[PDB]
């Protein structure tokens, strides 16, 4: 059930 949101910040 992997998350769909970004795993890293934009930088």
């Amino acid at each position, epitope marked *: *059930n992997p998350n*769909a949101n970004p*795993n890293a910040n934009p*930088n």
Partner: antibody
Amino acid sequence: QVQLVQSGAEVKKPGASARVSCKASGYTLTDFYLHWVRQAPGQGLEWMGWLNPHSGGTNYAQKFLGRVSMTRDTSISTAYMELNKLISDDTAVYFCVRSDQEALRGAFDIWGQGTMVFVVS
Amino acid sequence: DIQMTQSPSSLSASVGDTVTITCRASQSINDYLNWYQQKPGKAPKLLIYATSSLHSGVPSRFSGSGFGTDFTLTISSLQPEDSATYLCQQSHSLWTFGQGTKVEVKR
């Protein structure tokens, strides 16, 4: 300290557009996703979408697709949200808010003070 | 979208009491569950992230537990300044807030 500073209240007719600006102070805007969340009177919070301030990419909630634009001017550390075709149900406090996708697993740690948008006939 | 609900919607407890607020998600969010405190006329303040991690500055009085679709916020040793609304929020797939639980502190 670390804060987000928002513009002042908007008074708009139905069908008009509301613009809110959001200035990052004490951190680099392009280092974090920037979200917009609104809270209508007597209700819970509603996530509207995010801006990647580095790339300019966005992810809008489907409820606001076609109506919302999230942009930024990285030279003045400022993000912008515009909401078009306003209806009475858009009357709310609008917050810009940073998330930390790494350390905080997507939680929202720095919130602007909020901007009131009044849709008035 | 993932829907969030909280129970109870309101509660009242004495100073020093332990209160527990539950949060449910319409589908599993693993441990991507955050808690906020909100007082009238203010922005929410982050309390707990990743189900149980305390954000910088939050007393160990606040505790979080759970996984998947069921979560708990526990406030031990309730204090007067804890009178507020407590909100859960999933950060697994987009972001969704619960509607909040109102906490009254008896005196």
